[PDB]
Design a protein around this ligand. Structure first.
Ligand SMILES: CCCCCCCCCCCCCCCCCC(=O)OC[C@H](COP(=O)([O-])OCC(O)COP(=O)([O-])OC[C@@H](COC(=O)CCCCCCCCCCCCCCCCC)OC(=O)CCCCCCCCCCCCCCCCC)OC(=O)CCCCCCCCCCCCCCCCC
Ligand SMILES: CCCCCCCCCCCCCCCCCC(=O)OC[C@H](COP(=O)([O-])OCC[N+](C)(C)C)OC(=O)CCCCCCCCCCCCCCCCC
Ligand SMILES: CCCCCCCCCCCCCCCCCC(=O)OC[C@H](COP(=O)([O-])OCC[N+](C)(C)C)OC(=O)CCCCCCCCCCCCCCCCC
Ligand SMILES: CCCCCCCCCCCCCCCCCC(=O)OC[C@H](COP(=O)([O-])OCC[N+](C)(C)C)OC(=O)CCCCCCCCCCCCCCCCC
Ligand SMILES: CCCCCCCCCCCCCCCCCC(=O)OC[C@H](COP(=O)([O-])OCC[N+](C)(C)C)OC(=O)CCCCCCCCCCCCCCCCC
Ligand SMILES: CCCCCCCCCCCCCCCCCC(=O)OC[C@H](COP(=O)([O-])OCC[N+](C)(C)C)OC(=O)CCCCCCCCCCCCCCCCC
Ligand SMILES: CCCCCCCCCCCCCCCCCC(=O)OC[C@H](COP(=O)([O-])OCC[N+](C)(C)C)OC(=O)CCCCCCCCCCCCCCCCC
Ligand SMILES: CCCCCCCCCCCCCCCCCC(=O)OC[C@H](COP(=O)(O)OCCN)OC(=O)CCCCCCCCCCCCCCCCC
Ligand SMILES: CCCCCCCCCCCCCCCCCC(=O)OC[C@H](COP(=O)(O)OCCN)OC(=O)CCCCCCCCCCCCCCCCC
Ligand SMILES: CCCCCCCCCCCC(=O)OC[C@H](COP(=O)(O)OCC[N+](C)(C)C)OC(=O)CCCCCCCCCCC
Ligand code: SF4
Ligand code: SF4
Ligand code: SF4
Lengths: 176, 102, 315, 70, 378, 97, 156
């Protein structure tokens, strides 16, 4: 089915021609536009008072990548490289070896945050919920080198944001 | 004497602001930077404005002209001038003179 | 005491211009569901001061100009004439009480077109000069209706004195008998001042001051914003005359000022509501719509006093 | 809210109010408490110059009534 | 004539004769990033985010086109709930694109106020994206096999509350543009395309319906569940910018009409194909079952193999016919992924549409073609 | 009348902030003088407020501490000064502070 | 008082003016320009901080590189930067301008706009949310507030 948007014939009876003459000479339709913006002057603006007010987000929000731990302090990451193999931007670099106690852990875990496309595929592919994207979105830096995270920066983010990452995962782990 | 003193202030003030606005910036000492085809339609609009302007000069004294005892003569001449000004507009209009399409 | 009088006129004009930028940015914001400047100072009152300081300490931009002397002449002419168009205005008593005050304002506004023309030459840019020619063509075109419309309203006042428009309107605003002229006069002031919907000089993807950035650009901005206020003050005196009580002059100024602010606000109101004309379309508005009607209403307003026995006094 | 636009409007109004208030008060200060004399035509100027001579002082805004007559 | 190099991401090299435009020569490639060559180095899941970033105003309609193409080669079918979510967010996305198209077009020719009214609506629709995917724009949410996750509880009620008021927002936009004589002067009889020229120049979308051609892939070649919704196709009569503007504004009203039916007819079930060799299993079963962990491991390292073949799958994206010619060699990475951006054929016809018009009309013509250079250059 | 009780709200904001000094401090630090319910204060001194009659987006806000980690933040406030536990409540990722 | 104190207050005044009238020239090259437009939209209303929506390059104080910078576009971006009157700052917005992002390994993409122009603030994201960009503009304002142009001149 379809409809015509602009296929109407204007009436030619004297009243309609005079109604159109009044519109042309007296600018009636240009004065409705003024009425529609005078309306908005007396509506409350939609602006929020950032940074004291923030824009609403959801538990799924994808922000700064971070590395997590078990409740015992042990790292969750067991150097499997599934996140590295799925990163579309090839932003993750991992190296690993047997830790001093025989465990399987990374010696390198870098994320080039200027290559990352903040897509969340890594946290989808991780079988142990080690690498996640936290809720932080305010980490702008003044130099390009501060955005090349290594394992210490990512572990620091996890310790720094675990209280909020854990509650976001608890709110959304049943949808995934 | 007031008008002469009024014009002197306005342009002297404007002159002072222009020069300081050119020099006040030149104290940051910034680093050294180290880095038409004639259109006949624009001419025609400029000429047409002139000829209409000269007609307006003849119409300007109308407020004083309506105080005379020969109103029958004055009103005829006043309407004659305005009408002839309309004829000029009608002529340019019908000769595609007011168009902008090449 | 006269030199003090001039400063009591010049300085408040520049402060009115300074805070018109703030009022324009908030009014547009609230019609756009925004807030406008509200951080720099309480309610943005310090925003104009921040912009002024920033502009006047920014790096000069002046590139190679072929007429450096003409580069300095344009802002001086633009700002000197903008302040000069205020001296005959009755508010209610004029600074310079001229017998031909109305003609004086037409004469001075017909010279401000040189600032546009000289700035185009002094920019050494063939595409800036084309922009100036378009801006000049628009301005002089709408000066034709301003003079003919103004001449038609003086045939009911009887003289070129600006103070006699107060007497003429002592019973009734001239807008009631001359609202057709007020409609065209008002839109002419928009086109004359190069304001939306007639600001094709700001067709970013579709100005002659580009060669001015900071400093002199700030002075061109003040001249333009000073003329918007002056034109809207002229409109109020001409079509919305205020009653004058000789023993309470300040009553006139309060009422007169309120009218002149509302008209200035309506310029912002209009800028927020409409798209802009093509260059040819705003020319066809003048030559093929306004000019035919203005000429017809000039004939009518010359003959109307004669046929009703309502010719005004010469003195 | 829209009334937050008013403080900017208030400053404009005061600034635009000063020129017309200042002129009215300066004219009365300079003309003995009266309006400045308007002389648009040469007859009005002739009377103003006649008042300047009649004034005794060289100022035309000082009026002499029925006390200079005998 | 006068040659103007209107540099920048568009570079127009025009040849002006007075105020008229005698020749318009768009120079593009200022946003060419080699997307098609990069996709050949990615698995099929890895190439999905590249499609959010082609027509970056209609992100989730680009994903659907890629997903329909890979699904066609895979020979699978997304589950019914996944198709209603894909048609629900296809129309939310069409509202996003048409707000950006009409209002940016209006802002270019002077009208700056409707941009701010409607970009608050875009801000609320960016929240629907962020509540299903976690990203405001580049969701990467529509995937071969269905969608990544299910709608969170409370979203559909929030979509309903937004949809009640949106017609009133369109009516305010029409109070500023539709009858405004200045707007009609900028658009009426500007950039007229004959129905035969439009077909031969490869036009699609409202570039055809504006000229009176009765064609819409959602109705002639339906995909997902568009055959189960009821809506009307707006048709122009003059082929000009004004009629194309009225088609777009009317399509927003029909999108709200479809959104009303998706919300009522949303069925239960799963949101990705119950085939763990194509769609990854749930994390709960990836951590208990040996098969699931194997299939999770291989779908996120190697990816799913796609049978050899070649498909040209197209949809009625908001800009027009968006399609992909996707060639599979049997491996887990695409062999070739040619992307058919509707704007590429439209912008190629700017020279024809600009003949006999002034310089300021070129701004209105580019706006009526709804050009985004993410898809033109790829 | 509604006109009068609009001015009541304007005055009660002066008292709701603890006087004229508090009213001015919030006006210049935060450019807002609304009064809301105090929901809690964190260990760094940030106070968090709430007003569910405001439209979504402006119904929760934080008045930042004037000193955090040995840095004077009276005029220099940053969005990253919100600790993670309150970050979740302030961005509406949850309803429970 | 001491000369440093007097010249430190003038530094504050000019620093205050420059960060209270940051007029940006936005190079809207790709999707990151949409989020830049959302920072001007009503919800964030960048114009309320003094940051006008869009200034001409010759009136601009900060350049926002928002999108992918391709080799074909690189010389054009440098020319606009060279024509910016000083003081001039550059904000790199998004992964493409930061380091090439998703197209880092492409034959036709500049691997970060900081190979063409100097960058003052890097805003991470793909795209950064309109709030993240705003947080980066407010960080540039804090960076202007810490300038010591007159102190260095005085102590020269
Ligand atoms: C021009 C005409 C006169 C303007 C009068 C404006 C006014 O009184 O607003 C009241 C009221 C505004 O209410 P509203 O805008 O509809 O909604 C606001 C909320 O109801 C209530 O909003 P709220 O809950 O956020 O109330 C907070 C507000 C409390 O409400 C007010 O303060 C409003 C009073 C403003 C006057 O407190 C403040 O913000 C105090 C600062 C106000 C800003 C500074 C305004 C001063 C401008 C004059 C500068 C000096 C000259 O005006 C009316 O609605 C009806 C009367 C409007 C015509 C005036 C007739 C007299
Ligand atoms: C630099 C200036 C740039 C041009 C702007 C200034 C305009 C100058 C003309 C002002 C006088 C006028 O036209 O109004 C007559 C006005 C019209 O007033 P009036 O017609 O009502 O008569 C006044 C006296 N009554 C009413 C009693 C008869 O004349 C006056 O008000 C004062 C009398 C004239 C004495 C002053 C003239 C001095 C000479 C001025 C020109 C100097 C050269 C300037 C070079 C300009 C280069 C562009
Ligand atoms: C006995 C009585 C005898 C005397 C009677 C004398 C008067 C009779 C009535 C005359 C008709 C009234 C003339 C009005 C002017 C008509 C001008 C015209 O040509 O219009 C058509 C023109 C052109 O109309 P058009 O573009 O549609 O095309 C007309 C011609 N055709 C169709 C062939 C192409 O329209 C405009 O002028 C619009 C200009 C843009 C306006 C944008 C700003 C709008 C702002 C609105 C607020 C204005 C408030 C003004 C009040 C100010 C207060 C101080
Ligand atoms: C749509 C675009 C254009 C719109 C322009 C709108 C602004 C122009 C002003 C329109 C409103 C009229 C001014 C009202 C405010 C003036 C306050 C004032 O002067 O005192 C009241 C004034 C009294 O001052 P007055 O001096 O004008 O009244 C006496 C009038 N004469 C001289 C004829 C005897 O009266 C009004 O303004 C009533 C306005 C009602 C109509 C509106
Ligand atoms: C309504 C508009 C009124 C505009 C004029 C108000 C007078 C200017 C007051 C500016 C004081 C700014 C300030 O220091 O912070 C507010 C102050 C804050 O009080 P305080 O307790 O933080 O005082 C210490 C201020 N510092 C940290 C800067 C040293 O409150 C006042 O206004 C006191 C006066
Ligand atoms: C009447 C018209 C004129 C306006 C006067 C009325 C408005 C004045 C408001 C009071 C201003 C006093 C300062 C406000 C209190 C305060 O300390 O706020 C700190 C604010 C905040 O500093 P901030 O920028 O670090 O704060 C950032 C974070 N927020 C905004 C959220 C708090 O900064 C200032 O107010 C400094 C103002 C400097 C004033 C410069 C005056 C220049 C004099 C003219 C130039 C002379 C040379 C030529
Ligand atoms: C309201 C009215 C608004 C209009 C009035 C605006 C007045 C604003 C206050 C002006 C204060 C002077 C600031 C001048 C700019 C300072 C500056 O940019 O520093 C960088 C410059 C540069 O410092 P530099 O020498 O170290 O730079 C060397 C590095 N290169 C080579 C790259 C340049 O500092 C100065 O040169 C200081 C100038 C002398 C001190 C000026 C004080 C004058 C105060 C009265 C005026
Ligand atoms: C005027 C009032 C009027 O004309 O009455 C209506 C009458 C009935 O006509 P109707 O059935 O409405 O349809 C047109 C049929 N000719 O109309 C008629 O039958 C009269 C014939 C209609 C044609 C009249 C054309 C005259 C128009 C000239 C312009 C009039 C305005 C001039 C003043 C302009 C300034 C306002
Ligand atoms: C009351 C009862 C009715 C009163 C009488 C009404 C009949 C007279 C009105 C006739 C209209 C004029 C003739 C006409 O229709 O011309 C229209 C034509 C428009 O063409 P254009 O704008 O270029 O675009 C075409 C796009 N297809 O344009 C033209 O052809 C050229 C028109 C030139 C005439 C207008 C310019 C003169 C304006 C002067 C107005 C004052 C009147 C003149 C003095 C009259 C003295 C009595
Ligand atoms: C005598 C030489 C002329 C200049 C006079 C000083 C003006 C500059 C200071 C304001 C900017 C400022 O200081 O910024 C805002 C300040 C707070 O700054 P802060 O965060 O504590 O500064 C931290 C240290 N920094 C800046 C080095 C990083 O707010 C205030 O309380 C200032 C409000 C009162 C201003 C009164 C101005 C009166 C002078 C008017 C004529 C010039
Ligand atoms: S979010 Fe995407 S781009 Fe960033 S590290 Fe994870 S997989 Fe790579
Ligand atoms: S973060 Fe997860 S997916 Fe990546 S190597 Fe560690 S355990 Fe494997
Ligand atoms: S960083 Fe992301 S959003 Fe920005 S231009 Fe690149 S792909 Fe688009």
């Amino acid at each position: 089915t379809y409809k015509y948007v602009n296929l109407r014939e204007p009436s030619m009876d004297m009243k309609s021609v005079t109604d159109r003459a009044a519109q042309t000479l007296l600018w009636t339709e240009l004065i409705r536009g003024l009425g529609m913006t005078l309306s908005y002057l007396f509506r409350e603006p939609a602006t929020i008072n950032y940074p004291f007010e923030k824009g609403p987000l959801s538990p799924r929000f994808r922000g700064e990548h971070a590395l997590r731990r078990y409740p015992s302090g042990e790292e969750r990451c067991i150097a499997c490289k599934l996140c590295e193999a799925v990163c579309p931007a090839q932003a993750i670099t991992i190296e690993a070896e047997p830790r001093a106690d025989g465990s399987r852990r990374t010696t390198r875990y870098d994320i080039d945050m200027t290559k990352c496309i903040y897509c969340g595929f890594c946290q989808e592919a991780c079988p142990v919920d080690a690498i996640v994207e936290g809720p932080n979105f305010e980490f702008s830096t003044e130099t390009h080198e501060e955005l090349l995270y290594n394992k210490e920066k990512l572990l620091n983010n996890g310790d720094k944001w675990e209280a909020e990452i854990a509650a976001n995962i608890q709110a959304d782990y049943l949808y995934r | 004497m007031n008008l002469m003193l009024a014009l002197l202030t306005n342009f002297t003030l404007a002159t002072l602001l222009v020069i300081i606005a050119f020099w006040l910036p030149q104290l940051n000492v910034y680093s050294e930077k180290t880095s038409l085809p004639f259109s006949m339609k624009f001419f025609l609009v400029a000429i047409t404005f002139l000829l209409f302007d000269l007609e307006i000069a003849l119409l300007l004294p109308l407020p004083w002209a309506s105080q005379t005892a020969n109103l029958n003569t004055m009103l005829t001449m006043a309407l004659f001038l305005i009408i002839l000004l309309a004829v000029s507009l009608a002529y340019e209009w019908t000769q595609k003179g007011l168009e902008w399409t090449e | 005491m006269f030199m003090i009088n001039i400063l009591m006129l010049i300085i408040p004009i520049l402060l009115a211009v300074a805070f018109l930028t703030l009022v324009e940015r908030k009014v547009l914001g609230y019609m756009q569901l925004r807030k406008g400047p509200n951080v720099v100072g309480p309610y943005g009152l310090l925003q104009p001061i921040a912009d002024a300081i920033k502009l006047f300490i920014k790096e000069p931009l002046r590139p190679a100009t072929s007429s450096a002397s003409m580069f300095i002449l344009a802002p001086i002419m633009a700002l000197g004439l903008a302040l000069t168009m205020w001296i005959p205005l009755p508010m209610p008593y004029p600074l310079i009480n001229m017998n031909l005050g109305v003609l004086f304002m037409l004469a001075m506004s017909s010279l401000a077109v040189y600032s546009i023309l000289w700035s185009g030459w002094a920019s050494n840019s063939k595409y800036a000069l084309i922009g100036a020619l378009r801006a000049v063509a628009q301005t002089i075109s709408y000066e034709v209706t301003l003079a003919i419309i103004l001449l038609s309203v003086l045939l009911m006042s009887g003289s070129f004195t600006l103070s006699t428009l107060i007497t003429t309107q002592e019973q009734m605003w001239l807008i009631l008998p001359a609202w057709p002229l007020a409609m065209m006069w008002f839109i002419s002031t928009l086109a004359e001042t190069n304001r939306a919907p007639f600001d094709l000089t700001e067709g970013e993807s579709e100005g002659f001051n580009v060669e001015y950035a900071a400093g002199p650009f700030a002075l061109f901005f003040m001249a333009e914003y000073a003329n918007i206020i002056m034109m809207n003050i002229f409109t109020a005196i001409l079509f919305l005359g205020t009653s004058h009580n000789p023993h309470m002059p300040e009553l006139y100024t309060i009422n007169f000022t309120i009218k002149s602010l509302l008209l200035t606000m309506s310029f912002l109101w209009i800028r927020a509501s409409y798209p802009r004309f093509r260059y040819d379309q705003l020319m066809h508005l003048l030559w093929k719509n306004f000019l035919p009607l203005t000429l017809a209403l000039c004939m009518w307003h010359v003959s109307l006093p004669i046929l009703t026995s309502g010719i005004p006094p010469q003195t | 809210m829209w009334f937050e636009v008013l403080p900017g409007i208030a400053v404009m109004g005061v600034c635009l109010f000063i020129p017309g208030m200042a002129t009215a008060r300066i004219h009365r200060f300079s003309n003995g408490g009266k309006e400045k004399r308007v002389a648009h035509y040469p007859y009005q100027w002739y009377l103003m110059e006649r008042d300047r001579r009649v004034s005794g002082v060289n100022r035309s805004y000082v009026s002499k009534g029925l006390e200079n007559i005998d | 004539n006068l040659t103007l190099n209107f540099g920048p991401v568009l570079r127009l090299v025009m040849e002006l004769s007075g105020e008229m435009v005698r020749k318009c020569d768009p120079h593009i490639g200022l946003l060419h990033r080699g997307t098609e060559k990069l996709i050949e180095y990615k698995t099929y899941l890895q190439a999905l985010p590249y499609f959010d970033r082609l027509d970056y105003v209609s992100m989730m309609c680009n994903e659907q086109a890629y997903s329909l193409a890979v699904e066609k080669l895979l020979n699978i079918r997304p589950p019914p709930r996944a198709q209603w979510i894909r048609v629900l967010f296809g129309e939310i996305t069409r509202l996003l694109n048409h707000i950006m198209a009409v209002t940016t077009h209006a802002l270019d020719i002077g009208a700056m106020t409707p941009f701010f009214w409607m970009f608050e609506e875009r801000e609320k629709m960016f929240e629907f994206y962020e509540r299903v995917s976690g990203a405001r724009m580049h969701a990467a949410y529509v995937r071969p096999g269905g969608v990544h996750q299910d709608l969170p509880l409370g979203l559909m009620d929030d979509i309903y509350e937004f949809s009640k008021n949106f017609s009133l927002r369109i009516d305010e936009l029409e109070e500023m543009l539709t009858n405004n004589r200045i707007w009609r002067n900028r658009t009426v009889d500007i950039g007229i395309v004959t129905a035969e020229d439009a077909l031969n120049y490869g036009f699609s979308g409202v570039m055809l319906r504006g000229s009176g051609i009765q064609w819409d892939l959602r109705k002639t070649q339906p995909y997902d569940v568009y055959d189960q919704v009821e809506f009307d196709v707006p048709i122009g009569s003059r082929g000009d910018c004004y009629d194309r503007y009225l088609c777009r504004v009317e399509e927003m009203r029909q999108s709200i009409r479809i959104i009303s039916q998706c919300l009522n007819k949303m069925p239960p079930g799963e949101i990705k194909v119950d085939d763990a060799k194509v769609s990854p299993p749930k994390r709960a079963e990836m951590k208990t079952s040996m098969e699931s962990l194997i299939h999770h491991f291989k779908l996120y390292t190697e990816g799913y193999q796609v049978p050899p073949g070649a498909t040209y799958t197209a949809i009625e994206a908001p800009k027009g016919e968006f399609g992909v010619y996707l060639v599979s060699d049997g491996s887990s990475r695409p062999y070739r992924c040619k992307i058919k951006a509707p704007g590429f054929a439209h912008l190629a016809g700017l020279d024809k549409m600009s003949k006999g018009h002034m310089l300021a009309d070129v701004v209105a013509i580019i706006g009526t073609q709804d050009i985004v250079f993410g898809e033109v250059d790829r | 009348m509604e006109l009068l009780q609009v001015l009541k709200r304007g005055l009660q904001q002066v008292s709701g902030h603890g006087g004229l000094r508090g009213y001015l401090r919030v006006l210049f630090r935060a450019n807002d003088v609304r009064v809301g319910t105090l929901v809690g204060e964190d260990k760094y001194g940030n106070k968090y407020y709430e007003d569910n009659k405001q439209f979504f987006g402006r119904h929760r806000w934080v008045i930042y501490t004037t000193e955090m980690n040995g840095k004077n933040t009276f005029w220099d406030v940053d969005g990253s000064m919100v600790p993670p536990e309150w970050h979740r409540w302030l961005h509406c990722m949850t309803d429970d502070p | 008082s001491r000369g440093e104190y007097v010249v430190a207050k003038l530094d504050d005044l000019i620093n205050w003016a420059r960060r209270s009238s940051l007029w940006p020239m936005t190079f809207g090259l790709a999707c990151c320009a949409v989020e830049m437009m959302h920072m001007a939209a009503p919800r964030y209303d960048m114009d309320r901080f003094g940051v006008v929506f869009r200034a001409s390059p010759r009136q601009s104080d900060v350049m926002i590189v928002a999108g992918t910078l391709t080799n074909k576009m690189a010389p054009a971006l440098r020319k606009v930067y060279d024509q910016m009157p000083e003081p001039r700052y550059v904000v790199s917005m998004g992964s493409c301008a930061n380091g090439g992002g998703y197209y880092h390994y492409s034959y036709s993409v500049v691997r970060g706009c900081d190979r063409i122009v100097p960058v003052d603030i890097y805003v991470p994201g793909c795209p950064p949310t309109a709030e993240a960009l705003l947080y980066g503009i407010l960080q540039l304002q804090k960076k202007i507030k810490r300038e010591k142009r007159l102190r260095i001149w005085y102590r020269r």
